[PDB]
C-alpha cells in the first residue's frame, strides 16, 4: 500500500472493557432448597443451580439464604451477578435473591476485606444498569 496512505483504524481482537470491572485488587421454617443450592455452589453446577433458582416464592428464598452457609453466599452472589449480566430479563426475578443475600449475610461480607474486588461482577452489572437512568428518563419524558 502507498507510503502516503495513512493507517486506518482497526480494533481487531482488542478486549473492550469498562472502567468498573474491579476484578483485581422442630423444623418450623419451611421446606427450603438449600442443600441443593449448597452442592450446586460447591461444584460449578449450572443445571441444578438453575433448578434451585427457578424457585421464586419469597419466603422460600428468604429462609433458604438464611440456612445457607455464609462462606459461599459470595459465590451465590457471583453466580447471580453473572446470570443477570448475561440474560437481562432475569434481573427482575433474580435480584430478589441478591437483595436477600445482602440482608441476611450482612456481617460476613462486611467483614470480608475486599468487597468490590470479590464481587466485581455485581458492581459492574449494577453500574451499567443504573448508569443510563437519566437517558431513559429523558426518553420517557
Amino acid at each position: 500500500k502507498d507510503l502516503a496512505s495513512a493507517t486506518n483504524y482497526v480494533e481487531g481482537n482488542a478486549r473492550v472493557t469498562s472502567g468498573d470491572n474491579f476484578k483485581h485488587v422442630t423444623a418450623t421454617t419451611t421446606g427450603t432448597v438449600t442443600v441443593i443450592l449448597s452442592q450446586a455452589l460447591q461444584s460449578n453446577d449450572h443445571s441444578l443451580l438453575e433448578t434451585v433458582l427457578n424457585n421464586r416464592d419469597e419466603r422460600v428464598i428468604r429462609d433458604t439464604i438464611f440456612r445457607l452457609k455464609p462462606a459461599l453466599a459470595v459465590i451465590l452472589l457471583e453466580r447471580l451477578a453473572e446470570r443477570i449480566a448475561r440474560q437481562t430479563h432475569r434481573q427482575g426475578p433474580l435480584n430478589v435473591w441478591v437483595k436477600w443475600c445482602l440482608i441476611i449475610h450482612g456481617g460476613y461480607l462486611v467483614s470480608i476485606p475486599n468487597l468490590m474486588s470479590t464481587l466485581s461482577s455485581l458492581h459492574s452489572t449494577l453500574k451499567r444498569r443504573s448508569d443510563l437512568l437519566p437517558r431513559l428518563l429523558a426518553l420517557d419524558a
Binding site: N8, R15, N21, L139
Partner: protein
Amino acid sequence: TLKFANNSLLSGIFLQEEENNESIVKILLGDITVPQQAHLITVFTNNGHVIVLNYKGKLVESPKHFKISLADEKLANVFHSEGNYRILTTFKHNSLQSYRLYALTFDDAKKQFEVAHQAEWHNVILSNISSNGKLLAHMCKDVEHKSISVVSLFDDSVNLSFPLGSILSSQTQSLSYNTRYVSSMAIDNMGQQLAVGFASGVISIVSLADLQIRLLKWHIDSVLSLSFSHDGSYLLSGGWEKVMSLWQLETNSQQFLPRLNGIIIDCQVLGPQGNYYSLILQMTENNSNSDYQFLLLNASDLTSKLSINGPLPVFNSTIKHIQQPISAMNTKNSNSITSLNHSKKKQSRKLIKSRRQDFTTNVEINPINKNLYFPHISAVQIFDFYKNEQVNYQYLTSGVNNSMGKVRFELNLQDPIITDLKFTKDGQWMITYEIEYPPNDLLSSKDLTHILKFWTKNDNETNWNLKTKVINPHGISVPITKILPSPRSVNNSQGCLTADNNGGLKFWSFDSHESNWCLKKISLPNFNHFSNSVSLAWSQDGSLIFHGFDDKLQILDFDTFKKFESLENTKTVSEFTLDSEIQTVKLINDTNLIVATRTTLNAINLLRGQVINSFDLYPFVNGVYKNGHMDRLITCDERTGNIALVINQQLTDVPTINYKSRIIIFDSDLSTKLGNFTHHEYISWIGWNYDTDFIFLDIESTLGVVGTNSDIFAEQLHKLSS
C-alpha cells in the same frame, strides 16, 4: 537541503524577531545571469532579491544574488517562456489589490535587472496563469458586478474581457451568493477554454471565442482547485471532499481518487507529457494551524510518488493570521462566504486584546528510537527529527476521519480528540486518551465519551496495534486530567496511572496471565468540587506517588494506595497546601521535587522536609495558559537539571502579533540559572529526550534543541558518457 539559517548569505535576508513577511515567491530552473549553460536554481523572493544557488554538491559561500530596482510593489510571481522574462506586482476603494506586469532584461550592468511595465489591472479579485505561463486570467470588479479578463503576457496574441454575468446562469441571480461566488479559475495552453469553479460546487467551462458555457456538477461543496492538462482535454478538480477528480472533457467522465488526507487546495499536471500531478492538501481537521501536505503522484497508477510534509502539531489556539479556507457554510472546520473578513478581524483583535494567549501543545518522544509523535486530531504523526521527515500517520480513534470527505453540513462534526498519549518507559506500549464527541441535535449530544487505549508494536513495524481499550475509565462522563507512565520497578515499566478531576486515581497494569492491560489499583474520593489542575509524579524507587491536585499535593504510598502514614508521626507531612492550584509536581530525583503553580514556583526536599527555594511566575505566566499546560511548558532531566520557559508577547511604542521566548535552565534544585536563552519566536513545548538534550517546538514548527592523458580521458569520458 539548502539551509537558510546555516549561513549569513541569505539568513541576512531574514533572521528577524518580528518580520517574516519576507517570503520566497518563485523558483526557476535555469540561470538568469548567463544563458545556454543547468544544475542550479534562481530563487525570486517577495521583496526583490534574486539569489542564484547551486544545489548540486556543496552550496557556494557567495551566491549570485541581485536586488531588482523595485517600487513599493511586493512580487506576485515571475514568468518564463522562450528567452524572455515577465514579473507581476501587487499594490495598495474596498480593499482590493492592484496588479502590474513588467518585463525584465539584465545584460548591460551585471547587478541590476531592468524592468519595462507592460500593463496594469487596477482591481484584482482572483487570478490564474496557464501551465506554460503563456497567458493569464483574472477578475476585475468593474461596474454592476465583477468582470473576467484574459491576456497573453509574452506577446499581444490575445487579450479579451467580458462581464461574468454572461458566464453566469439565469438561475443563479435568484439563488444564494454561493451560486455566483467564484473560488477557482483556470485556463488551458491555447486560451480556448476557461474553467470557472464556483463556491456552490459547480464548474463551468466557457469557450472563450464565443462565451458558450458547459456545466460540470460533481462537487457537493465548494470547488477549491482547478487545472487543465497540456492538451486541454482533461480537467483536474479538487474541493472539500478529499477526492481529486479528473474530468474527461470529451465524454464528461470522471476518474476519482478519493481519500487524500486533506482537501485539495491546489492541483496541477506537471510533466512534459503530464505524467505527474502535484497537489497541496490542507488537512483541516485541526482549526488551529494551516498545515499543508505537498503530494505529487505519478499519473500512471495514481500512487503517491514523493509526498512531502512538515511536522503537524495542533496548538491550543489559532496562531498567526491563520484563516481556515472558504466553503459553503460557516462551520467549525471552515467559514462561509461572508465571514472571512470578519473572522480575520476578530482573530487579530483576539491576539491583540485578549488574555488567554496560550497555544501550547503536547509532543511525545518514543524512548526507543527517539522519534517524536505529534498527536493530530484523531491521529498521530510519527516523525523523526534527525532527517525531519514523517515516519507515518495513523488513525487512533473511530470517527469518519478517513472513510469520507465531509462536506457543507458534515464539517460541523468533529472526530475524537487525542488529548494525552504517553509511552511506557521502555517504549513498548503507548497509552492514549481520547474524548469522543457526539453529534449535535439529539438526546446524547451533551455527554462525551472518554476512551483510554493501549497500543503495542515490536521494534520493526511502524504502526501500533490496539491490544485493549477501556471506555469510560474513572466512570461515565468524567475526564482524565493526567496520565503518567510508570517507572521500571512496578510491573517492569508496564503500568500507567490515570488521574481524574475528582482527584481519583486508577493504576492500570499489564499482566501476562490474563493477556491484557487491566485495572489493578484504585483510590477514588467522592468530592463535590472538580478542578482540572491535576498533576502527578512517582518516586523512581516505585514506592510513593505525589498526587498534585488543586491547592493540595497529597502523598500516597503504593502498597495500600492511600495517603502516606507512619505510626511514629515523625513529622509525617503528607499534604502541602500552596497559594494557588498547582500545575506541575515534577520530581527531579528522589531527594526533592519542583512544584509549579500559577503564582510561584516552589521546590520541596524530602530528605530535609521543607521548602528550599521559590520563584516568581505571576509577572510572566499569569492568566495566559490554561490550567494544566505548565506541565508541557516546563520539563526536567534525569540527572542534569530542570527547564523553565516563559513567553513575552512583544510590544509597540499595546501588545502585538509578535512573540519572543525566554527559556531558562536550572541545575540541582533551582540553584543556578546556568542557561538563559532567548528565541526569536513563540515556543510551545519543551521536553527531554533520553540522552541529555532538551527538544523544543517553535510555533512555526522548527524543532530546536538545547544541548551540552588518463586524467583528462577520465574526465572527458564521464562527460561524454552521461
